[PDB]
């Protein structure tokens, strides 16, 4: 259980902006998600999750987390997260001298053994259309990472230095257990 804290996952930004209990939501993409799903996806910021027992087989992953449902990890109760918008708030990204950023994943329930896959929407992706697997390229992977003493995972990832547009970073954190729990988060970013 957890979420991408930096660059903040979509549902985490919605949550931390607040307003959804008293009709003061500040952002119009956050409002539209709320209109479709209510507060559930925001208060459940740490369980954007799907179980894939055959987790090493991407054909099995894509049968469970289906095109147009990646940001909700296939949960219809979180479907508002998947809506296309020009107004999703973006984290401005400047890569370090090695073309990296430190991704920070805040875990309420650390899980090991596990592994990580990082995907990036391609330059032809239209943010007004829900994300599909065909929109994504794998940019980096990680193995079993020990959680910090502050219950955050820190992972240096390499991103392309040729990008200057807005994109979705798609983080997959996969447990290596019988049930095959995995956590799927979309992070809206603006390369600058
Ligand atoms: Cu968990």
**What determination technique applies here?**
X-ray
CATH (domain of 14): 2.70.50.50
CB 5 within 8 A of CB 104: yes
Cα separations in angstroms, 133 against 14, 87, 124, 142, 168:
23, 22, 13, 19, 12
CB 127 within 8 A of CB 179: no
**Residue 60 annotated as binding?**
no
The structure tokens listed for 121 are 């929407």
Q: Resolution in A for the shown PDB structure? A: 1.4
- Give distance in angstroms: CA of 146 to centre of ligand 1: 15
Peptide bond into 38 cis (omega under 30): no
Q: Taking the CB of residue 91, how many other CB atoms lie within 10 A of it?
A: 16
Query: For residue 28, what is the enclosing H or E element?
Result: helix 28-37
List the structure tokens of 6.
Answer: 């930096």
- Give CA–CA dist 42/115, Å, rounded: 25
1 annotated among ligand-binding-site residues: yes
Local structure of 190: helix, strand or coil? strand
Question: Containing domain of residue 85, as a range?
Answer: 2-191
Token pair 């502050």 is at which residue? 150
Q: How far apart are CA 56 and CA 53, in angstroms?
A: 9
Q: How far is the CA of 76 from the centre of ligand 1 (A)?
A: 19
- How far apart are the CA of 126 and the centre of ligand 1, in A? 32
- The span from the CA of 98 to the CA of 164, in Å, is 16
User: Is the backbone peptide bond immediately before 113 cis, with ω within 30 degrees of 0?
Assistant: yes
For residue 180, give the nearest of 1, 60, 50, 4 by alpha carbon: 50
Question: Cα(111) to centroid of ligand 1, in Å?
Answer: 6
Q: How do beta strands 2-6 and 100-107 pair?
A: antiparallel
Calculate how far, in angstroms, residue 110's C-alpha sits from the geometric centre of ligand 1: 6
**C-alpha of residue 141 to centroid of ligand 1, in Å:** 20
Following DSSP, what letter does each residue of 126-176 receive, concatenated?
Answer: -TTS---GGGEEEEEEE---PPPTTSEEEEEEE--TT--SEEEEEEEEEE-
Q: How many domains does the chain have?
A: 1
C-alpha 180 to ligand 1 mean position (Å)? 11
Residues with CB in 5 Å of ion ligand 1: 1, 109
């Amino acid at each position: 259980h957890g979420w991408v804290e930096y660059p903040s996952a979509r549902q985490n930004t919605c949550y931390l902006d607040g307003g959804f209990w008293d009709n003061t939501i500040p952002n119009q993409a956050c409002q539209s998600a709320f209109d479709e799903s209510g507060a559930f996806p925001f208060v459940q910021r740490n369980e954007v999750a799907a179980n894939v027992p055959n987790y090493k087989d991407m054909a099995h992953v894509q049968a469970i987390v289906r095109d147009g449902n990646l940001c909700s990890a296939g949960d219809k109760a979180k479907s508002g997260l998947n809506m296309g918008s020009t107004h999703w708030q973006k984290t401005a990204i400047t890569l370090d001298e090695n073309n990296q950023l430190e991704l920070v994943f805040n875990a309420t329930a650390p899980h090991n053994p596990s592994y990580w896959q990082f995907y990036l929407s391609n330059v032809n992706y239209d943010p007004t259309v829900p994300l599909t697997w065909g929109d994504l390229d794998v940019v980096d992977t990680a193995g079993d990472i020990i959680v910090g003493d502050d219950k955050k995972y820190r992972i240096k990832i390499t991103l392309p230095a040729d990008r200057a547009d807005s994109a979705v970073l798609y983080t997959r954190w996969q447990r290596e257990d019988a049930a095959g729990e995995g956590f799927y988060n979309c992070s809206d970013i603006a390369f600058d």
